[PDB]
Design an enzyme around this catalytic site. Structure first.
Site, PDB file in Angstrom:
ATOM      1  N   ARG B   4       1.799   5.138   6.961  1.00 39.42           N
ATOM      2  CA  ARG B   4       2.424   3.878   6.723  1.00 39.42           C
ATOM      3  C   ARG B   4       2.933   3.316   8.071  1.00 39.42           C
ATOM      4  O   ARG B   4       3.730   3.991   8.729  1.00 39.42           O
ATOM      5  CB  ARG B   4       3.565   4.056   5.782  1.00 39.42           C
ATOM      6  N   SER B  58       4.727   1.316   0.150  1.00 44.20           N
ATOM      7  CA  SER B  58       3.279   1.449   0.152  1.00 44.20           C
ATOM      8  C   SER B  58       2.766   2.228   1.347  1.00 44.20           C
ATOM      9  O   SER B  58       3.288   2.080   2.448  1.00 44.20           O
ATOM     10  CB  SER B  58       2.655   0.067   0.155  1.00 44.20           C
ATOM     11  N   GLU B 107      -7.238  -2.842  -0.595  1.00 44.20           N
ATOM     12  CA  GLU B 107      -6.225  -2.371   0.333  1.00 44.20           C
ATOM     13  C   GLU B 107      -6.000  -0.861   0.236  1.00 44.20           C
ATOM     14  O   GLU B 107      -5.439  -0.240   1.154  1.00 44.20           O
ATOM     15  CB  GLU B 107      -4.935  -3.153   0.041  1.00 44.20           C
ATOM     16  N   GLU B 109      -4.049   1.321  -1.507  1.00 46.58           N
ATOM     17  CA  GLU B 109      -2.722   1.829  -1.315  1.00 46.58           C
ATOM     18  C   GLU B 109      -2.402   2.896  -2.304  1.00 46.58           C
ATOM     19  O   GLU B 109      -2.877   2.939  -3.450  1.00 46.58           O
ATOM     20  CB  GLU B 109      -1.694   0.760  -1.503  1.00 46.58           C
TER      21      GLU B 109
END
Lengths: 41, 185, 103, 103, 103, 103, 103
Positions: B4, B58, B107, B109
């Site tokens: 992250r 996330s 994405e 995530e």
């Protein structure tokens, strides 16, 4: 209704609180110091 | 492991007990009934941050996706850090839990419910002028034996937690029907 | 010898199981004379104590009373949920005889 | 027996309930002969001690004093808030008779 | 001396090694007169106890039963995986004589 | 009684305060006969011990010396910060009298 | 009075400094009769033991053998690195006389 959303928050938080207790069992256990029970008793 | 990019420095992440959602001051602070809703998390946007609102933080599956994201939300930052994080059951794969309703399916995530505790942070890389200093700083407070085996939580456990509104079509179809809370569908 | 807290608790007179399945809400500890005890309370409203070593305690129990207060303090700081308690119901608060925790 | 700290504190002469609801700011531990004791302070300025084993203590109090010092050390290292302290106020620093914490 | 649990266990009559390679599922602790013991279970169904300090125990075994009970409380709250267990197979539940944890 | 470590330190002969304000750099523990002690070192260059018990020590210091050795093992292991040491400096290494941590 | 484990280790008949510079790989604890020991191993393949309490050990050493067994358990669980070991190289496995940890 807001029930769907309260029930989501409430099941979510029970899932978080449980996890926070496994974490505390990990880190606070480094402070636990055992007692010689035959000594003090 | 999971990555992250965040602008929040290591000592701040320590002082808070981890990478916290928006609003949650420190990890064990039960002094704020934080709104936690994965569906609401997955659709939000915060300037300056990778999705960290509505009770989840996330993360990306790879150092380059984490970088990519870093250069969009944090471009022109002199410094920011990419956090390498261990998989544990507080993490949910968003595409799996939200299915065809995943807002940003591309994405890829993986979200952590409640923030990532400092013990789960394996280390971090420092990023200067957009460029990743490839020397990884290890978090000595990381609990190696305990995260060594753990994996992400299965989407089955996630389904009841998806957070779709009471009237969202999802609650009436497969697989969520079978896990819909009291008052959903 | 008993394989479970319910088997064991059944071997005693004046005991009863409580299925708590919750963490302790509050911990109190006293070194005041004649009240060297621990009291724990749950959000159900139930209060329990680990009783003072006394007259009706065989000496093997006296070291086991000390262990119980140690398990109760770390079970409280780490928030671990107690599963069941076998208690003696002939004391106020009911007194703890055995504890079990799982997961 | 008592069920709460406020009830337990009141069977004694010269006790008092401090409400703290805060964590220990510092822990001082001494092995100086004649000053074997822990001192703790809270950010509010308050300071308390677990006094030295001496003649003001019945024999059962000696293992409890030892447990209290264990509790105050692990409470300080884990930063757990202390709800209330019941202290003997006939000395400076006021000495701890009971502690309660809630979660 | 032995250098291994399989080898330490080898030397006693009515011992059995169990490879568990899992964390303890439940922990039960009793202070009930004459049932002052610890029972642990594993999800596989196996239940094992730490024997109530009986007659044949030398005082080195007294301190060692008290230490085994410590290790099991801390292994259970930390979720550390037990590799192997040497038990006495002529007692029910089987009785722990030794434990090993690896990595 | 004294309310801080610098006050307690001042009641004794041959003592001094070492403001450390750092975590223990190394921890050595010995169980070799007549040298059953603990030695700790800090980045600053200083070395301190916790003395072998003997006859310079009242019985209460024998329990307190074991405590101090427990505290220094946990503070080393957890990288906890020590504020100040009060030590008897007529000994080599200097000898720990009392200790304090601030949060 | 030694300020280091090599210093201390040079004072006995039959010892050897070992630089381990590693965390424990495995831990074993036996409560079995006559064999109340702890055996640890390292990825070097090197095994050591804390020896059984026996009447040759004076009381200072008995308390100290129990402290070392407590240190080897929580060092193993916290995955802390041992730096050096002083062992009595005359029995198998070599007996720990002292242990040191750094950083």
């Amino acid at each position: 209704g807001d029930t769907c959303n309260e029930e989501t928050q409430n099941l979510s938080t029970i899932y978080l609180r449980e996890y926070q207790s496994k974490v505390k069992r990990q880190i606070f256990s480094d402070y636990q110091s055992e007692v010689d029970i035959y000594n003090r008793i | 492991r999971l990555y992250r990019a965040d602008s929040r420095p290591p000592d701040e992440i320590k002082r808070s007990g981890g990478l916290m959602p928006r609003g949650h001051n420190e990890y064990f602070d039960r002094g704020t009934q934080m709104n936690i809703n994965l569906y609401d998390h997955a659709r939000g946007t915060q300037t300056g941050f990778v999705r960290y609102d509505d009770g989840y933080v996330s993360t990306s599956l790879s150092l380059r996706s984490a970088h990519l994201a870093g250069q969009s939300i944090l471009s022109g930052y002199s410094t920011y850090y990419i956090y390498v994080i261990a998989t544990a059951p507080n993490m949910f794969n968003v595409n799996d839990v939200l299915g065809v309703y995943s807002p940003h399916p591309y994405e890829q995530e993986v979200s952590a419910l409640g923030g990532i505790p400092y013990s789960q942070i394996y280390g971090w890389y420092r990023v200067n002028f957009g460029v990743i200093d490839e020397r990884l700083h290890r978090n000595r407070e990381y609990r190696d034996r305990y995260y060594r085996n753990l994996n992400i939580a299965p989407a089955e456990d996630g389904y009841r937690l998806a957070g779709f509104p009471p009237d969202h079509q999802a609650w009436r179809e497969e697989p969520w029907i079978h896990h819909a809370p009291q008052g959903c569908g | 010898a008993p394989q479970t807290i319910t088997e064991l608790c059944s071997e005693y007179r004046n005991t009863q199981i409580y299925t708590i399945n919750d963490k302790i809400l509050s911990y109190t500890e006293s070194m005041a004379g004649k009240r060297e005890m621990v009291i724990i309370t749950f959000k159900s409203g139930e209060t329990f104590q680990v009783e003072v070593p006394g007259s009706q305690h065989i000496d093997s129990q006296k070291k086991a009373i000390e262990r119980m207060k140690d398990t109760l303090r770390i079970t409280y700081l780490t928030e671990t949920k107690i599963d069941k308690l076998c208690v003696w119901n002939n004391k106020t608060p009911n007194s703890i005889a055995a504890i079990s925790m799982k997961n």
